[model samples]
Target: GAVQLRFDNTYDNASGSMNTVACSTGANGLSQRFPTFGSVPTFPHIGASSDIGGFNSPACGNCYTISFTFQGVTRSINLVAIDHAGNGFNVAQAAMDELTNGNAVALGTIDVQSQQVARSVCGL
Candidate 1:
C-alpha cells in the first residue's frame, strides 16, 4: 500500500450507512464502480491491492485493521473494501480524514494485517 490514499464515493452503488453492494456478497462478488472525486472527509472504507504495483491478487472483501500515526496521534482504522480497478489504495473519506486529520492526503507508513488476528486475540 502506498503512503498516500484516494477516495471512491460513487453514490449509485449503495447506501453509506451499510453498503449493500459490499455486504451482500463476499469479496469474490464485489461490484465494481467508479468513485466520486473529492477530498472531503467521509466514512471508513477502502480498496486493497492497486495495479500500480501489480497488487491485483483478488484480495477483495478482505479486512485489515490498519494502524498509523497522523497529526501527532496514533490512530487505528478498520479498513473494509477492496478496489479491483487497479487504482491503488483508495480509502473512504473518513479514513483519509483520520490519516490526515482533515487534510486531503498525508504520507505515513500504515501497519496493516488480518483483522481476524486482532479479533482472535480479544476472543471474538
Candidate 2:
C-alpha cells in the first residue's frame, strides 16, 4: 500500500528574513551535503513543513521529484528542494507560474503506493 503526501513551499518570512534557509554549519549542524535544499542548484525544488519530516529522512536526500499536469502541459521537476520545515512549502513562486504557463499558480493532484520504492524513484 501507499500514502498520500501534500507538498507546498518553505518559508521563514520574519519581516524579511530567510529563517527557512539552511547551512551545513548552521541549523543543519553538519559539514555534509544531504539535507540542504540550497546546496543544490535545482530551481524548482520544494521546502517542507516540519510535519513532513518523514520525507526529510536520511534516505530521502532531502529532495523529491514532482510531476504534475496543468492545463495542456505535463511537467516534471527533478531535484526538488525541501529546506524549510513548517506549513508553507509552496513551490518556488515562479514554479507555479511555469506550471501554469501564464501568470498564475497552477497545479492539480496525484497519488502513490510505496515509501521505500517511492524514495528510490525520481518522480512518482
Candidate 3:
C-alpha cells in the first residue's frame, strides 16, 4: 500500500526497544508478541495506522517493505509493525534516518510504498 511515513523520536532509544505502543501496554509493547523486541534492530520498528494496520490487526508483529525515492534513487527498508498510528506509518527516528540516508530532518514526512511480508523478511 502507498502511504505516508513520519518519524517519532519516542520510538527511538539506545536499547533499540519499542516504547509504549497503542497496540499493547508496558514500556515495550511489542514484547507482548515478540519477547525479544529489545534485541530487534531499530530500523525495522514502525507504528502503522488503522488504514494499513491496527491494534489486534493481523498486521501486528508483521513485516513490511517500505520504499521511497531520495536523490533520484529509490530505496527500500524492511519494517516491523510494533504500534498503531492515526494514518500511514509513524516510524522510529532511526528507521527514518536509515531510509532517508540521514536526510529525514530535511525531508520530514514523505510518501512511500508499503508491502506486508513474512516475518522472516525482517529476520524476526
Candidate 4:
C-alpha cells in the first residue's frame, strides 16, 4: 500500500514508557488479539495506527515495512499495527524520527510505500 506516513507522539512517551493507545487495551486491542507480543511493541521497534478500519481493521496486530526516499537515499522502517487514525499511517514519534532521521518535524507527512509482512518483521 502507498500511503502518507505521519507521527503520533502520544503513542509513546519521552521516558520510554508505552502509552495505552487504541490497540493496547479494550476488546479490540492488539495485545488481546496477538498476545504473543506481550504488549505493544516499543520504540526502536515500531507500532502504527491505520485509517482503513480503525482498531477493528485486519491491519491491527499486523506488521508492515514502510519505505520512503529522502535526499537521494531510501530508508525503511518496520512497524506493527497498534492504533488507527487518519488516511495513511499514524505511527509513534520515535519510529518517525528513525525513519526520517529527525526530519519528520519538517516534513510532517510524506508519501511512502508500505507492505504487510510477517509479524517477525516487527520482532513480534
Alpha-carbon local distance difference test for all models: 0.42, 0.38, 0.68, 0.65
Instruction: Work out the TM-score per prediction.
Output: 0.48, 0.44, 0.77, 0.75
* Candidate 1 per-residue C-alpha lDDT over 1-124 given as tens digits, one digit per residue, 9 for 90 to 100: 4243465544212343222333223435433331221211122445433422322334444555655565577666655444443444566555656655665334432333224223222211
Worst 10 residues of 2 by lDDT: 11-20
| Residue 25 accuracy (lDDT) in model 1 | 36
Which residue pairs clash in candidate 4? 49-83
User: In order, how many clashes per candidate?
Assistant: 3, 12, 0, 1
Candidate topping TM-score = 3
User: Ten consecutive residues with minimal summed lDDT in candidate 3?
Assistant: 14-23
* Model 3 ranges with Cα > 4 A deviation: 14-19, 25-29, 33-37, 41-44, 51-54
lDDT ranking from best candidate downward: 3, 4, 1, 2
Tell me the tens digit of each residue's lDDT in model 2 across 1-101.
32233434442221222333432234432224433444434444444423244422342234454455555676655534344344323455454444445
Q: Candidate 4's error at 1, in angstroms?
A: 5.4
Best by lDDT: 3
* Model 3 whole-model lDDT (C-alpha atoms): 0.68
Model 1 TM-score, all chains together: 0.48
Q: Deviation in angstroms for 44 in model 4?
A: 4.4
